[PDB]
Ligand SMILES: O=C(N[C@H](Cc1c[nH]c2ccccc12)C(=O)O)c1nc(Cl)c2ccccc2c1O
Ligand SMILES: [F-]
Ligand SMILES: [F-]
């Protein structure tokens with residue numbers, strides 16, 4: 445297996461969950477402002493190498509992530525993309541870089557990470573500055589849906605498996621709150637979700653930044669939660 449939940453993962457350990465052939469999520473837990481949350485990222489096979497989407501929310505968790513990948517999959521992570529500037533996405537980038545992983549993020553994400561005092565991916569991803577932009581990166585498509593959870597948030601689609609990784613722009617079905625909205629655009633977020641809905645109508649699995657994967661319902665649910673919050 446079942447998808448692991450927060451109480452099943454001690455802080456510092458990482459689980460992998462097979463989503464499709466050559467596609468896994470990674471699940472970690474971290475303490476933030478005195479509460480513990482689970483957090484997801486993605487791993488996508490690209491021949492005899494792996495592409496990583498997002499860190500495991502901190503240096504120690506990300507070291508544990510690399511160890512778990514080596515144990516379970518046995519292929520090297522050669523590139524990583526961070527989908528927004530918050531620490532659940534970039535915290536651990538230094539561990540990755542020092543391990544030889546080429547780390548990437550949009551210029552917006554890199555600027556915001558630097559201003560926040562967070563770790564900074566090495567390389568810039570151009571072609572993603574306008575809402576609706578899409579670029580190919582190894583075995584995935586990167587898509588900028590517009591401002592949502594943050595102004596820089598990206599989503600990731602795996603065409604070969606019809607897997608949509610929504611990152612923090614997409615909420616799990618059990619979420620009742622938009623959560624940390626300090627950097628969010630609640631007015632635009634439903635429109636950004638609609639852009640995702642329209643661009644990936646064939647998605648079979650949708651993975652949120654935190655919590656359980658599901659189907660396309662997670663997209664509409666997200667728009668509903670964020671609109672109810674704003675209201
Ligand atoms: O209030 C939140 N969540 C509650 C609980 C919840 C339900 N389902 C969940 C699935 C995963 C994590 C929390 C949940 C909800 O929406 O009812 C909340 N969630 C996350 Cl992630 C946060 C991350 C970073 C900073 C603050 C956060 C936050 O406030
Ligand atoms: F986040
Ligand atoms: F996120």
Ligand SMILES: [Zn+2]
Pocket residue numbers: 528530593594612
């Ligand atoms: Zn965030």
Ligand SMILES: [Zn+2]
Pocket residue numbers: 621623624
């Ligand atoms: Zn909360």
